[PDB]
Amino acid sequence: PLGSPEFAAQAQALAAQAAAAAHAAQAHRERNEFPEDPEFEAVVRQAELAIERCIFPERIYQGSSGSYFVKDPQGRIIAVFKPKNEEPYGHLNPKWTKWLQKFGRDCLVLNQGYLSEAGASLVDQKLELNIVPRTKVVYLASETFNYSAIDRVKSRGKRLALRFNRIGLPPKVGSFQLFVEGYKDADYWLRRFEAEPLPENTNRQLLLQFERLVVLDYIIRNTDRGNDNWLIKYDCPPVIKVAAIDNGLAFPLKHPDSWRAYPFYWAWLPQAKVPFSQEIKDLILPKISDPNFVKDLEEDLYELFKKDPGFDRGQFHKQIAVMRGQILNLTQALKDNKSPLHLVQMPPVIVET
Amino acid sequence: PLGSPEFAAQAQALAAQAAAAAHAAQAHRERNEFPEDPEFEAVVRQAELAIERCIFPERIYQGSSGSYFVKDPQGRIIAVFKPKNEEPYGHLNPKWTKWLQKFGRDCLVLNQGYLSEAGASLVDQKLELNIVPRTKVVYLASETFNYSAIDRVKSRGKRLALRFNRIGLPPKVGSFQLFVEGYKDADYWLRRFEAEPLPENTNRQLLLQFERLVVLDYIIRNTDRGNDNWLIKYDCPPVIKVAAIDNGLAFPLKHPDSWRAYPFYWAWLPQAKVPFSQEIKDLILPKISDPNFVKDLEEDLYELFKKDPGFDRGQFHKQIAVMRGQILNLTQALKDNKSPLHLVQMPPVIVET
Amino acid sequence: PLGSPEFAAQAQALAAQAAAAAHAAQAHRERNEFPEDPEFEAVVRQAELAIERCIFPERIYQGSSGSYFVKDPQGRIIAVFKPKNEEPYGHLNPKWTKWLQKFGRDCLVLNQGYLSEAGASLVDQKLELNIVPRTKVVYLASETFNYSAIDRVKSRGKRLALRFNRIGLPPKVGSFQLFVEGYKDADYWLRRFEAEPLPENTNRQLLLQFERLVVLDYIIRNTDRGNDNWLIKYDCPPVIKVAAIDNGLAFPLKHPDSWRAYPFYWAWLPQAKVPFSQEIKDLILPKISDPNFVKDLEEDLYELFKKDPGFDRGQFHKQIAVMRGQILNLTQALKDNKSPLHLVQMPPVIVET
Amino acid sequence: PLGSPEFAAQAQALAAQAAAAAHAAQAHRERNEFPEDPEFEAVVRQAELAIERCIFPERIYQGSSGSYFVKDPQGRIIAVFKPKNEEPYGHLNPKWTKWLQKFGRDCLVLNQGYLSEAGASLVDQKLELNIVPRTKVVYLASETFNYSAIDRVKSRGKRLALRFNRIGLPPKVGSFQLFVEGYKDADYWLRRFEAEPLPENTNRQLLLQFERLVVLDYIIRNTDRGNDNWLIKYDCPPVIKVAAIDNGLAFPLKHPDSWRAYPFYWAWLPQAKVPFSQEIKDLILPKISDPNFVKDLEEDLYELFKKDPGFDRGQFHKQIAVMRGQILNLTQALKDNKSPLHLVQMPPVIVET
Amino acid sequence: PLGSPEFAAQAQALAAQAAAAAHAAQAHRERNEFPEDPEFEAVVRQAELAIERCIFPERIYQGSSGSYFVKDPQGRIIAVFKPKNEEPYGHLNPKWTKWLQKFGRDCLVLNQGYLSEAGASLVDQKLELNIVPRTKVVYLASETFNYSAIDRVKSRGKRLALRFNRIGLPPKVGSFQLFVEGYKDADYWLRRFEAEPLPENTNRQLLLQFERLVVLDYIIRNTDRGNDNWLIKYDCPPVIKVAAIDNGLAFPLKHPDSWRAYPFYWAWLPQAKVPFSQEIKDLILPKISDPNFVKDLEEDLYELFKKDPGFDRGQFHKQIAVMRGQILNLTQALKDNKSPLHLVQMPPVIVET
Numbered sequence A, B, C, D, E: 001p002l003g004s005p006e007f008a009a010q011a012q013a014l015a016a017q018a019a020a021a022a023h024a025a026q027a028h029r030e031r032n033e034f035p036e037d038p039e040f041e042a043v044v045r046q047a048e049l050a051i052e053r054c055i056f057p058e059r060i061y062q063g064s065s066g067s068y069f070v071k072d073p074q075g076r077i078i079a080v081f082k083p084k085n086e087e088p089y090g091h092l093n094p095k096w097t098k099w100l101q102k103f104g105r106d107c108l109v110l111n112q113g114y115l116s117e118a119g120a121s122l123v124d125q126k127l128e129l130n131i132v133p134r135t136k137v138v139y140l141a142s143e144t145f146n147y148s149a150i151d152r153v154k155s156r157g158k159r160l161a162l163r164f165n166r167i168g169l170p171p172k173v174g175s176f177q178l179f180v181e182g183y184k185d186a187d188y189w190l191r192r193f194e195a196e197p198l199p200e201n202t203n204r205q206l207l208l209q210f211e212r213l214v215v216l217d218y219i220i221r222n223t224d225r226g227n228d229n230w231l232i233k234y235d236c237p238p239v240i241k242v243a244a245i246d247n248g249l250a251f252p253l254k255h256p257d258s259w260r261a262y263p264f265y266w267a268w269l270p271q272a273k274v275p276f277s278q279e280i281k282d283l284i285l286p287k288i289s290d291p292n293f294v295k296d297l298e299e300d301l302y303e304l305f306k307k308d309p310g311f312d313r314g315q316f317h318k319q320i321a322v323m324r325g326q327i328l329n330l331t332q333a334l335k336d337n338k339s340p341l342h343l344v345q346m347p348p349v350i351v352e353t
């Protein structure tokens, strides 16, 4: 029916349903569905629930201004939430990027912290490191988040959606990282271990965890890893665990102008001279040296990243080019039984496809 | 020394000191000095003090999103603070006004609520009504006010001024109205009085207070007087007092397009039919019928108003033209022993100078 | 003669001579006169001389693309020259700065490397540290510098100035740092000393030098000090000397967004835990705690900085505000016999005047 | 399958492969393949090879700033390379052409020297003159070419392409003309011949070569032929050869405003009065008087020319119109046994199609 | 006191009074004062008076849409009022003139009808012709004029000026021409006279009047004189009078492109062949041939014309240049006892000063 009334009717079926799909996309996102990870989705519902019952995510007192401790309805801290528009460069929305070079010393993209945060977790899972607490992109509305004067006043009047939902403040997008319990700043424990050495079996464990951290931080090329920035959990009377937690500043789009800037702080630790174990070599090498694994990972990051309103294909390629370079270096250092310290000394490479 | 080296040196004395004055004006304002009213200034210091000791002005739960209960260091509520940039139209700063007509149904100016608030108090004092709690333009900085993401992050780092002041968040300008104790919504009491009439002596008092309210609300042509909006204080075992408290929406720049919109809600009360007393006639008439009193008042409002960044001489004339018209009507109704109700029925006049 | 023919003639004396001064300013700068330091000026003449005789400054092979080893007519390396327009952000000349915020993660100004370079030397002298080899702002023309295609072709034809000078390529402005002989990367020596400890008297010397480095790097808040970046000279059969040499990335305009980025690399050395000596306390404290010394230094930097075409008063204040903050911290740590390591741990302060 | 799923899939086959073709076009060009002339391609590989082994094309000392002597890995000069962006008007890239007339005295196009250079060779081959050394459009990257500050710094970091190529500096496009050995400035020999006349047989040879030069220079209407600009090779104890070498300024788009400007310098030589031989008449006439030969040549030049980013169809027609006019004049002078001198005296014609 | 406090105070006397003068100029104009002609001013007051008492100027039924019959309070027609903004090209206010040539066939200025109207009267008086009824530039406000929707609604609300004037609609500027009684279309009478000739004495009178018309229409170069356009008053049982009444389209800025367009319609009448009398020659020649009279007249028109908001000095010169040309021709034809018909046949001249 190439030019017939039967087809022109079908084209109008598609037209109006595609406009129905495009109208109701924002509501579909703000629903927070994770078919692929029900355990996480549960914790989000729990977060949403305490919000209704009026137990509000509270600002983190000593950290940044942009991060919140999400509480469950009982009162327990269950997650950390960092909203996109509460990041430092949260303004500058009318993308002003193409106007700038058509620059600069900056090596990170402008306002995609929450996506770095989420992407770190995504690389973690793909590599099976389990050091980054599951963290995903999530919508949340709360009295305690930083809204604008207009946003607040608009929201005093009763509003209803249509499925007769009440509408509070506009939900903010951000990273929602699962909170983990009984951990401490890596350096706190690290210096105690210096005073008291650990039983060699336990210490062998700490070292396996630490290697995983190195791998993760090298691939995403974290910009901001201190030794206060990862966490160690350790209880004596016997397991020891690390948690990689502050990954808002990774996935740069070029290696920094000077090598000295943005160092990996763990590279100065004595642990860093210990050559990579076999355990890490056959957990990681089978993956990162398969071109399909890297191809598949790149695409996972593409999907996650595109979500952002400000997404730029040009940037994403630059970002991936850096990562490829890291993967390359890492592969080498893994094949030659080198150590984390050796790895950070290898000259940075970019790989263009 | 009209073109000599002795004078050219004196001109450079003036140049650099006038630039020193213009540099350090913002710090001079944010200091909150009131030579003319030390009692008020004291309460501001007290507000500033609790801020340092970490007793923060808290958001008013049931009212608007833009208003805060300032507390003293003890915990007592001492003032209401409404910041300019937390008003509904707080955005729209790059004055976009001349671009609009060179409009509209709107009869109030855009973002000068705090000045209406302050101006109401200023008219109160000039007329000696003492129904508006002293309220002035004040700078305050606090964790609990609504700042932007940038403003917050910028302020985590230690900053010092130079007289080695610490610098918190940037101080906000707004209205700072003295809080008054033991009052209730005018209509709460008003309906009780209907059930229980008041002793005629007390009732005569309520009526004197009420006349003052009428006068104030008519001259500034309040846009937003409900009967929940003014307050009555009354304790039995014998004085009764009114408080005019929510004057953010007065000093319009034209009479509203339709007379029916923005009514004075007290005009429907039975009290409003009672003709103006002698007490009010010789408290007000000697003032508002002296052209110099009005001239002097206009200039007080000019000085207060100009403070605003968005101030517009064109608007201020329109504003004053309306007020003159009200004063005119009021003068008439006062000379002819008319009642508040009669007064609100008189056709609105504008007076152009 | 306020409006007379005698004065109008004098005003024309000034008009045409001020236009003569403004015409011939560029030639006056490109002359490289240093009344205040004849020893340096000599070395510049020597550099200019080898240029004529065709001994060309050669590109530094392993470093950056923007730096040249200036040779005397004999062949000896006598200076390092880094031209402004060969810096990384050398383009972007039509100042596009005000168009950007009226940003950003960048904490250094755009294209003022040569001035940081020169300013470091200027702070050195003022404090009498003598660890930075004298370095000033200098004009040089050479075949080997990176010119544009036009600049090169234009310069094949014979040109003459008028004092019948020949004109080669257009002279470039940059930093001209005196070359120092027999030094090596600080870490080269530092690790040898670890194998072989130094005689305690010599080692006490190394420590006095090192303190000076700390002081310099903290005040200008160098962004880019590695342990390959300063140099140690040491000959055994007994003095030891440091040279602070790569100061192109100091005088930031804000403390970096994250404390972890741009660390001072010497802070990890064991030397850094040794508390500040008396020798440094009475060489520096008498200076940096006199408000006039700081006032005088600020003005020296102002004069040097303004030279740049892109200079911005707004930036320069931000820059000075940072430095004041450093001076403040430094003063404290010097009074309390603290160590360099303690000093870098003190929270960064900004001081606004 | 005009609107079916089988076809929509095929359209996506084309879409993504055409985008793959368009992505990887620049890499395809920078490869320098000449199926049609393997002997030339070889010399390019040889040039590329010495570049890797670090034998760099060196600047031509006495000529222009834009030309380089390409060396093979042995050290021998094998080619002359003139990059497009090192031509005099190499800037002005954002084509600013249509903005200019919607002018001027200029009769050559702005920045297509390398194409004139290449086109001269292309006309040579088509006419079988063999006086222009084979010269084609070629990409080359080298330390010694004139790059920008950014281009240089960007290229210090290791980069890799993906077929795991290393990436040096960005390759420049230009003309790559085969270097020819043992030649001298035409006038050098020409004046010696005046002192010593040549054996009449040899001299008859010189004259056949010279006619070919005339033909070539007249058709492309070279703008810049001196008598230092073509070369004669001559060895006594017996052949003599000319080489037409500097053809960067031909293919004008109009005849010059004044006939006197841009003369053909050989027209003043005594040789120029000698009428065209039969040898040239039946080598050239059979060609240039066949309309198909001219049609075919025009299309060869079209293909070569379009390569340029700045190409303009409007200009190319004007260019071809001039050439047609020359061909016309030339045909005439060839039919009537006229001499080169007669030919240059014939009034310039333009032929529009 | 050239730079003293005594003078700076006097300069502020001038500043604020000159701003007082400039503020209250519009009110000063809208007052309609004619010191120089009290008889006219009276009739304006009378017009204003009937307006208040609600006897409104009524639209002229058969003429243009822009003209009104002003009535006195009794009901008698006393004047014709043509408002500027009711002319055909009344829009186009934001002068768009300089944007047009930096054109055209149009030979009149855009929207200055009322000034032509007024200027005709002004030329009449200066020459003492007394055929144009006194007409001046006048402000009037009336319900019946054509106002905009906004103008009307704005004016329902009571407004007062400050000398406690009420404010009706905004007053319009226009021409206010005295109405004259018992006249008829010139051609009505003219054709009757053809049937009945007039007594020769009366006819001699008609001819003197007619000459005056010719003079007036030629000098201002009326564009639009029909024979219905001037009026004759004639009563039998003995004077006869003409009235020149519709002069809205004179003072062109160039002679029309074609001579045939805009003819003087009286030129076809038989009267027009009768040579100019002595009476007109010594009433006009003594004037128009004195250069000072013309100089003085030009300045009177300048003053009148400048009033217009759209006034343009460039145009006014062109206008005066045309008139000078007419005066020149007229002078000639008056000296040589020529007739009106001869005069209109003389080629148009422009005279530039």
Ligand SMILES: Nc1ncnc2c1ncn2[C@@H]1O[C@H](COP(=O)(O)OP(=O)(O)O)[C@@H](O)[C@H]1O
Residues within 6 Å of the ligand: A060, A062, A063, A064, A065, A067, A080, A133, A177, A178, A179, A180, A181, A183, A245, A246
């Ligand atoms: N997923 C997590 N589980 C447990 N503790 C966390 C987690 N994320 C952050 N923290 C802790 O909470 C605080 C939050 O700060 P962080 O998220 O690192 O950003 P910043 O310090 O820049 O605000 C830190 O003390 C950190 O140790």
Ligand SMILES: Nc1ncnc2c1ncn2[C@@H]1O[C@H](COP(=O)(O)OP(=O)(O)O)[C@@H](O)[C@H]1O
Residues within 6 Å of the ligand: B060, B062, B063, B064, B065, B067, B080, B133, B177, B178, B179, B180, B181, B183, B245, B246
């Ligand atoms: N100066 C004051 N003294 C005492 N009570 C006040 C004062 N101002 C406001 N209130 C009370 O506090 C609440 C604040 O609301 P208000 O200032 O009227 O603005 P909104 O209701 O629009 O937020 C009201 O309940 C009012 O009764």
Ligand SMILES: Nc1ncnc2c1ncn2[C@@H]1O[C@H](COP(=O)(O)OP(=O)(O)O)[C@@H](O)[C@H]1O
Residues within 6 Å of the ligand: C060, C062, C063, C064, C065, C067, C080, C133, C177, C178, C179, C180, C181, C183, C245, C246
């Ligand atoms: N003033 C100086 N005296 C002696 N050696 C120097 C001096 N400046 C730099 N060098 C040395 O020369 C090289 C130049 O590099 P440098 O100026 O540090 O910048 P980059 O390494 O970024 O090019 C380094 O090896 C350094 O050790």
Ligand SMILES: Nc1ncnc2c1ncn2[C@@H]1O[C@H](COP(=O)(O)OP(=O)(O)O)[C@@H](O)[C@H]1O
Residues within 6 Å of the ligand: D060, D062, D063, D064, D065, D067, D080, D133, D177, D178, D179, D180, D181, D183, D245, D246
């Ligand atoms: N293809 C070639 N073969 C041999 N010699 C050449 C060739 N091209 C140029 N030369 C010689 O090398 C020098 C290069 O200059 P040229 O290419 O003519 O441009 P310019 O003189 O404008 O730089 C000249 O001396 C010329 O004689």
Ligand SMILES: Nc1ncnc2c1ncn2[C@@H]1O[C@H](COP(=O)(O)OP(=O)(O)O)[C@@H](O)[C@H]1O
Residues within 6 Å of the ligand: E060, E062, E063, E064, E065, E067, E080, E133, E177, E178, E179, E180, E181, E183, E245, E246
């Ligand atoms: N000053 C005047 N005195 C007497 N009658 C007039 C006067 N002006 C106009 N009229 C008459 O009133 C009518 C008005 O028309 P007029 O002013 O000529 O312009 P239009 O015909 O274009 O509207 C005409 O009939 C004219 O005869």
